[PDB]
Amino acid sequence: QYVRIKNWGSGEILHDTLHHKATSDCLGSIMNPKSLTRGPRDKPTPLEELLPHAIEFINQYYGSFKEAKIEEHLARLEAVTKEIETTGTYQLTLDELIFATKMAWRNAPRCIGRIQWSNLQVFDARNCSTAQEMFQHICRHILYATNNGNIRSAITVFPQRSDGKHDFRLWNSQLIRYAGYQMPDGTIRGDAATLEFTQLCIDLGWKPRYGRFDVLPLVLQADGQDPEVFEIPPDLVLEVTMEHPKYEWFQELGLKWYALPAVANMLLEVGGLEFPACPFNGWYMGTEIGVRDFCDTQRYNILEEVGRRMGLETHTLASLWKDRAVTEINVAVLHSFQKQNVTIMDHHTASESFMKHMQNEYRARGGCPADWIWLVPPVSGSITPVFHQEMLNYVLSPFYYYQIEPWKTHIW
Amino acid sequence: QYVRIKNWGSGEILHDTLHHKATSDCLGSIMNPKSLTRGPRDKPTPLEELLPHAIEFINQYYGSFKEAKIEEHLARLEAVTKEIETTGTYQLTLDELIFATKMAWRNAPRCIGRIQWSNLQVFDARNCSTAQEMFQHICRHILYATNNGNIRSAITVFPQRSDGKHDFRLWNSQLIRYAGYQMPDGTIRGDAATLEFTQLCIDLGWKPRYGRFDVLPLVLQADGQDPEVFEIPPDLVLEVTMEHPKYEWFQELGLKWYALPAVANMLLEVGGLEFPACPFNGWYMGTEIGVRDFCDTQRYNILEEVGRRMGLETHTLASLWKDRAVTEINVAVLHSFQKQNVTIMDHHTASESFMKHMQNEYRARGGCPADWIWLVPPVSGSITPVFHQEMLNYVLSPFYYYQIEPWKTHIW
Numbered sequence: 019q020y021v022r023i024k025n026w027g028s029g030e031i032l033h034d035t036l037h038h039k040a041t042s043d044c045l046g047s048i049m050n051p052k053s054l055t056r057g058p059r060d061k062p063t064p065l066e067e068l069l070p071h072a073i074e075f076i077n078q079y080y081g082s083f084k085e086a087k088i089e090e091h092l093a094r095l096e097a098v099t100k101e102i103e104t105t106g107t108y109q110l111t112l113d114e115l116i117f118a119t120k121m122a123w124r125n126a127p128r129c130i131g132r133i134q135w136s137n138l139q140v141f142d143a144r145n146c147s148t149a150q151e152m153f154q155h156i157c158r159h160i161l162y163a164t165n166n167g168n169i170r171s172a173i174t175v176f177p178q179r180s181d182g183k184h185d186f187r188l189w190n191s192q193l194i195r196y197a198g199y200q201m202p203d204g205t206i207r208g209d210a211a212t213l214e215f216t217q218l219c220i221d222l223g224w225k226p227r228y229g230r231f232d233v234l235p236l237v238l239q240a241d242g243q244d245p246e247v248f249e250i251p252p253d254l255v256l257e258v259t260m261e262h263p264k265y266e267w268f269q270e271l272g273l274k275w276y277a278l279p280a281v282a283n284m285l286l287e288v289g290g291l292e293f294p295a296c297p298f299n300g301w302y303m304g305t306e307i308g309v310r311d312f313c314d315t316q317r318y319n320i321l322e323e324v325g326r327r328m329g330l331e332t333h334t335l336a337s338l339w340k341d342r343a344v345t346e347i348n349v350a351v352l353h354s355f356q357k358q359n360v361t362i363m364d365h366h367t368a369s370e371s372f373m374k375h376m377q378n379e380y381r382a383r384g385g386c387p388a389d390w391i392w393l394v395p396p397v398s399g400s401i402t403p404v405f406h407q408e409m410l411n412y413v414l415s416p417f418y419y420y421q422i423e424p425w426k427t428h429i430w
Numbered sequence: 431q432y433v434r435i436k437n438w439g440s441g442e443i444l445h446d447t448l449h450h451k452a453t454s455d456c457l458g459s460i461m462n463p464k465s466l467t468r469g470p471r472d473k474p475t476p477l478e479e480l481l482p483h484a485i486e487f488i489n490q491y492y493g494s495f496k497e498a499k500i501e502e503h504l505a506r507l508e509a510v511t512k513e514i515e516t517t518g519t520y521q522l523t524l525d526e527l528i529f530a531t532k533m534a535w536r537n538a539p540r541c542i543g544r545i546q547w548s549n550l551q552v553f554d555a556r557n558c559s560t561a562q563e564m565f566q567h568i569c570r571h572i573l574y575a576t577n578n579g580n581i582r583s584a585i586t587v588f589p590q591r592s593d594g595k596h597d598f599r600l601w602n603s604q605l606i607r608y609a610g611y612q613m614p615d616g617t618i619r620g621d622a623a624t625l626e627f628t629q630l631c632i633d634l635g636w637k638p639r640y641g642r643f644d645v646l647p648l649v650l651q652a653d654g655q656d657p658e659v660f661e662i663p664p665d666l667v668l669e670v671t672m673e674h675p676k677y678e679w680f681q682e683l684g685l686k687w688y689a690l691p692a693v694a695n696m697l698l699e700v701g702g703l704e705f706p707a708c709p710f711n712g713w714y715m716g717t718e719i720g721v722r723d724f725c726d727t728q729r730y731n732i733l734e735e736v737g738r739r740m741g742l743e744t745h746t747l748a749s750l751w752k753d754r755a756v757t758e759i760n761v762a763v764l765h766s767f768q769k770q771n772v773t774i775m776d777h778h779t780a781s782e783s784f785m786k787h788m789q790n791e792y793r794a795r796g797g798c799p800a801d802w803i804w805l806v807p808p809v810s811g812s813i814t815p816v817f818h819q820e821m822l823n824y825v826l827s828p829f830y831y832y833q834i835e836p837w838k839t840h841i842w
């Protein structure tokens with residue numbers, strides 16, 4: 019009938035009717051395509067579907083390392099099949115889970131730090147059962163991951179999905195994130211992107227401290243019950259104060275950002291089993307903070323003013339003042355993280371690494387799922403290698419799917 | 431079996447086998463997909479296919495302007511049908527051709543200057559018949575288009591394809607382009623991207639002047655005959671000397687570039703009819719010269735040295751020296767074109783315009799074919815609006831398809 023299209027900048031929406039007149043023989047520019055999402059359930063996974071996937075995975079895992087263990091393979095294959103027919107679902111050996119997480123990461127077409135896919139700390143929280151218990155596992159995660167600035171990649175795996183009405187889910191987009199408050203005088207303070215979610219926290223009893231960098235509360239839902247609100251212990255949230263290595267007035271901007279990039283709302287699918295809650299984290303890439311968080315008009319939007327303070331022709335677009343500015347914001351981010359001994363990688367070194375990984379991936383298994391639109395840094399495109407590298411985007415398994423925002427499909 | 435992937439940077443090739451293990455339910459990152467190419471022929475277009483397309487077009491053209499001319503419509507419809515059944519193919523009224531070119535441009539998903547789609551000079555050369563005659567039409571084109579710096583968009587349409595063995599084709603990638611010579615001492619002088627083609631010109635009798643900016647010869651093939659070589663009159667090729675508005679040493683780089691961006695090897699398809707030769711041109715966008723031509727490692731590659739001359743940490747990647755440099759090269763390009771009174775638009779203003787166009791397009795006809803991967807400038811991505819705009823890529827009609835390089839499918 020018509021496809022909806024969103025301009026994440028102005029938020030505006032559009033309905034494309036013209037595409038119907040296409041000749042035939044692409045949704046690559048879409049953000050959250052239903053092909054990359056794995057929604058809710060109401061009934062368990064039909065055994066006929068589960069068994070095939072489960073069998074494949076056990077073959078992937080067992081046919082993973084050098085010199086196989088056929089005895090164990092066929093044994094596990096059997097033990098797994100049986101468990102499925104007797105219990106319905108099944109449990110992955112801790113080793114399998116570890117293998118599962120690293121693979122799913124490895125199979126993440128939008129990630130650029132996949133060269134690190136093997137170095138990942140795994141926290142088995144499959145035995146968890148309450149919100150308070152989640153909050154604890156999450157805190158442990160944050161503490162381990164942060165590591166006083168020397169960031170360590172980790173993922174905490176909560177109980178897999180069973181029937182559907184019993185799902186473990188973190189409502190936050192990511193572990194640490196700033197709140198966005200709509201001020202009385204119309205202005206928007208904080209992270210404009212978290213406006214709607216900040217409200218939900220308010221509605222659930224959270225006390226808004228109306229500031230620019232107020233760390234949002236953890237909103238967790240265990241088993242199936244309603245989400246409970248927990249504030250993250252301030253001692254656990256390490257931040258970095260933004261300061262330029264030449265511009266003294268940069269510190270006067272009063273900017274800062276959290277050191278831990280931990281995605282909290284994705285679903286890890288593996289061997290037919292799916293875990294709707296599994297927060298993971300790596301470390302930041304400069305451009306993410308300096309270009310996205312800081313310069314997007316839908317976020318902190320600091321380009322206009324960082325420009326003036328540089329004596330740039332803010333009103334003459336062709337002067338390339340925007341190019342000039344963002345780069346200085348980037349050096350600030352990079353410089354500040356380096357100065358405050360917090361791990362971070364610049365987009366150039368990062369790209370060179372993905373290219374290295376990508377080639378290691380084809381040589382190792384003839385392939386590497388890669389979404390160009392996401393891998394190319396928000397700045398200095400072609401100055402980067404990945405820009406010139408053609409790539410094939412495809413969903414393998416295990417995989418880290420997206421999921422329908424919980425506050426939509428959830429009866430209280 | 432396996433899909434081939436090219437790294438246009440190092441030129442390296444790869445075979446993707448892994449994609450076979452995909453779940454299912456994307457080739458968006460590919461350069462020349464067969465879906466965007468319209469190859470050779472050996473027999474005319476089967477009447478059963480031609481008539482339907484032809485009919486549609488006549489409906490598009492006639493149902494174009496306000497208050498239709500039904501009398502003429504049904505009349506043209508008839509006159510066209512008849513002509514097809516009696517002659518085989520058919521001729522477009524000059525008006526239709528004009529409408530055809532503007533539409534095809536309008537339907538170009540990779541173009542960012544489509545807001546200009548209505549302002550396009552059309553040169554009807556459908557009566558042409560020889561190479562020498564082509565060269566003349568092309569020169570006239572260059573002269574009109576250049577207009578002493580005030581660039582004007584234009585397109586010259588040569589005789590449409592008939593049977594297949596009688597094709598008019600320009601062998602050049604674009605009207606004006608620099609030669610790339612492989613030097614004795616291993617080094618590559620000029621435009622490395624034109625290495626193979628420069629050789630073809632040598633093989634066809636062209637005399638190489640072994641320089642950095644030697645304008646390549648026009649290689650045209652008329653009717654069906656072999657391609658003839660013609661040198662473009664130097665008085666017709668307007669260039670711009672690169673100089674920075676602050677760096678005196680920039681002029682010392684000895685850089686320069688042609689002012690006319692004229693794509694010469696594409697095929698205009700319309701109402702079933704296809705014209706394998708129709709060179710068009712608009713005006714340059716800063717980043718194209720400064721970022722692509724100048725900074726691509728596969729081109730003039732000037733980043734390394736422009737860096738040093740700026741006293742940048744050329745050996746410390748994290749210093750963001752590359753970001754800093756390219757921006758200065760961009761200001762040079764932009765500044766030089768402005769100073770030498772030659773039309774050119776910066777990527778920012780250009781993007782803002784495409785966004786304006788895109789919205790004018792949905793409001794006017796609910797759609798606008800847009801390939802994100804191509805519309806997003808090679809630098810300052812998210813600093814641009816189009817980066818955040820989701821878009822649908824689809825091939826409409828009329829369309830400007832690519833085509834198999836002539837020196838491959840051509841018996842002498």
Ligand code: HEM
Pocket residue numbers: 119123126128129130131132134138171172173281284298299300301302303306363368392418
């Ligand atoms: C170690 C450093 C890492 C870096 C530098 C890094 C960087 C990135 C970047 C730049 C993106 C795009 C994010 C955006 O613009 O919204 C991304 C996406 C992603 N990363 Fe990585 N990452 C790292 C580690 C990890 C780890 C440890 C995992 C998983 C265990 C992972 C899983 C993913 C996934 C699934 C996405 C997609 C998120 C989405 O679609 O919104 N990454 N990463």
Ligand code: HEM
Pocket residue numbers: 531535538540541542543544546550583584585693696710711712713714715718775780804830
């Ligand atoms: C008036 C100014 C114009 C500007 C600023 C402009 C700019 C651009 C840019 C940036 C691209 C991508 C080129 C690349 O990176 O390789 C492009 C592609 C294209 N443009 Fe436009 N353009 C303009 C006019 C035109 C005109 C007059 C036509 C046709 C009559 C046109 C047809 C196309 C086509 C078909 C492509 C695709 C070429 C390819 O796929 O290699 N453009 N243009």
Ligand SMILES: C[C@H](O)[C@H](O)[C@@H]1CNc2nc(N)[nH]c(=O)c2N1
Pocket residue numbers: 405406407408409438459460461803804805
């Ligand atoms: C691999 C990738 O498709 C390729 O290097 C690209 C991408 N997008 C592009 N964008 C433009 N405008 N022009 C190009 O040459 C390319 N090349």
Ligand SMILES: C[C@H](O)[C@H](O)[C@@H]1CNc2nc(N)[nH]c(=O)c2N1
Pocket residue numbers: 026047048049391392393817818819820821
């Ligand atoms: C419309 C477009 O898909 C969207 O704005 C993009 C594109 N690529 C991206 N790239 C990354 N890494 N992260 C993003 O949020 C986006 N968003």
Ligand SMILES: O=[N+]([O-])c1cccc2cn[nH]c12
Pocket residue numbers: 279280281298299300301302303306
């Ligand atoms: O930009 N990043 O660093 C980034 C983005 C998205 C997910 C992760 C995990 N670690 N770092 C990430």
Ligand SMILES: O=[N+]([O-])c1cccc2cn[nH]c12
Pocket residue numbers: 691692693710711712713714715718
């Ligand atoms: O970059 N450009 O200006 C550009 C690129 C590709 C085609 C045309 C035609 N005019 N300008 C063009």
